[PDB]
């Protein structure tokens with residue numbers, strides 16, 4: 508699912524600035 | 526209508542006055558007892574502190590001057606403190622004290638015990654549309670206020686929104702907020718929230734904040750952002766494509782709003798058109814929103830964080846408690862003269 512793809516992305520935690 | 530113009534004109538006069546003559550040096554370190562580390566970053570820390578005289582709790586952001594200089598953050602750091610002491614709006618965190626010593630810069634802010642929107646969203650999964658709309662209305666008003674000061678915010682994301690004891694939002698981070706009457710060019714922000722024109726090396730303006738609002742609304746309502754991937758470059762490629770998919774539970778009104786906020790063509794993006802912010806405020810998805818009642822905080826919040834009193838820290842994570850060292854030698858004095 509899209510949520511599963513979100514989890515697989517590894518970007519589920521707090522996101523740092525570039 | 527004429528009331529709004531008059532309110533924003535008064536507000537800009539007060540802002541520019543404080544902007545031109547910032548407050549400095551309104552407390553010192555030994556006025557405070559340290560209680561707990563609330564957050565740790567590459568240039569400093571945020572700690573829960575108790576003012577010894579009054580017993581009031583505060584969040585104290587502590588920035589290591591040498592790390593700030595090492596990481597090329599001098600202007601952002603000075604800018605954030607200058608913004609915070611000069612702005613005044615219900616959904617913006619209040620700066621109570623600031624000072625510096627040999628080693629560090631200190632900003633002492635009202636303590637928001639409910640923690641980041643981010644944790645609550647990841648815990649619950651996603652917010653219902655009424656819940657998401659409640660937060661969204663506050664960001665819309667906040668952006669209307671900041672844009673009236675010619676400030677582009679550029680750093681919107683659930684990580685940067687705190688939930689107060691009334692359930693309302695407080696915006697905390699202003700390092701990237703730039704005074705921009707025209708255009709600006711810096712690549713900065715968080716990948717998931719970057720407008721395509723920031724990725725595309727074009728000049729950009731405050732319209733990037735309305736794009737980011739679209740990202741935020743999508744993430745609050747879906748539980749995940751519209752554009753994600755294993756690596757930032759692949760997020761950039763999805764963003765600049767005009768392609769986005771919606772969860773099947775998104776209402777029709779919500780999708781129509783998001784199609785107009787997540788509009789690649791910034792000459793067709795809501796907030797950036799002839800009627801400005803009123804295209805958003807008057808959109809069908811916001812039909813039930815009492816804008817004035819939101820601003821006056823007279824709307825029953827959909828969620829109230831759990832707070833077992835003042836100084837409760839249960840909505841923040843646990844961090845290794847490190848010393849606060851203050852060197853015998855003044856570090857970086859010339860660079861931070863204006864702080």
Ligand SMILES: O=S(=O)(c1cccc2cnccc12)N1CCCN(Cc2ccccc2B(O)O)CC1
Pocket residue numbers: 563564565566567568569570571584618634635636637638640641684685687697698700
């Ligand atoms: O720790 S905060 O939640 C925080 C910040 C401001 C006021 C607060 C009032 N009550 C509670 C917490 C508060 N917080 C909001 C999210 C961002 N970080 C990350 C961070 C951590 C340490 C130093 C800098 C930064 B930074 O990205 O510039 C820290 C600040």
Ligand SMILES: [Cl-]
Pocket residue numbers: 520521
């Ligand atoms: Cl995390």
